[PDB]
Write a protein that binds this DNA or RNA. Sequence first.
DNA 1: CGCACACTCGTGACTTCAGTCATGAGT
DNA 2: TTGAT
DNA 3: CGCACACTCGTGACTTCAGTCATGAGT
DNA 4: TTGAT
Lengths: 128, 129
Amino acid sequence: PLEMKKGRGYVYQLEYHLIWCVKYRHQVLVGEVADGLKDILRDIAAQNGLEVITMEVMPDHVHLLLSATPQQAIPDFVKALKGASARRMFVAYPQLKEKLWGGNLWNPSYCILTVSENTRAQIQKYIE
Amino acid sequence: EMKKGRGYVYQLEYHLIWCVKYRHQVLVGEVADGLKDILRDIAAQNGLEVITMEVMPDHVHLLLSATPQQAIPDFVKALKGASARRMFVAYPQLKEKLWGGNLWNPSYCILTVSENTRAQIQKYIESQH
DNA sequence: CGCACACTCGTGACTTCAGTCATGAGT
DNA sequence: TTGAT
DNA sequence: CGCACACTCGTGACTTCAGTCATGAGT
DNA sequence: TTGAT
Ligand SMILES: [Mg+2]
Ligand SMILES: [Mg+2]
Ligand SMILES: [Mg+2]
Ligand SMILES: [Mg+2]
């Protein structure tokens, strides 16, 4: 049986692998800065109705595995996740301005991949 | 494999399914054939790639590939709302069983698709080296 | 190298009112 | 301030 | 009879200007 | 006008 969420006019299962990097690929996401970023990203995610299945912060990039509804558009939540986290991180960690004084904490691009929650076998069963 | 746009790199696939209103097995013969041409056309207009398409008498199944900017409610609306309008015009006999102004069930089912499961993907994430 | 996602300049949209998203072009 | 997830 | 995704009515947005999307409530 | 992909 397929894992499926139900909403008003749709049944769905939507997961994405989202990834982005620190501007200039600076390795600044370490220690308390990485810990903070985890809080900030979870708060933004919940504020936006996103479920964070997995989160991993490496020094120069972030990897998220998200579960969403059909109404949450990609450019919208990526903007929330990155734009708001940049704003907060700079406030909470003024020391970031030492390596990133240009007004950006993040690389201006994101990489995103859809993800199958269920197996190909489960899908053919449901689809047949 | 991975596509690119001005500010993003992505690979987006979705299984999209919806049924005929009241579950009537109406999509058959020339009606089904015309549905396919109408869907392919709508997909073309909206720049949506249709990887797989299947039309059963009571429901449709598509495997789509899209850009990050193509939101789900928008493309589902385009494919279902436009095809319905067009199907009734092209095949009026549909009205014999569906005179209420709806060719489609008001719901859609949609699943993100990838070349691996999240279980595997998350483990790959928890590693680092 | 010469791009390009990633660097830079530019545009508008819109939250975080800063710094992303959208976006074209030059290197 | 870049050099790849 | 009650549900709901699937039936219906209700509320709007927006193309297909009809019939879907958004959506809350009854059955 | 419904009963499940
Ligand atoms: Mg960007
Ligand atoms: Mg609907
Ligand atoms: Mg270019
Ligand atoms: Mg209900």
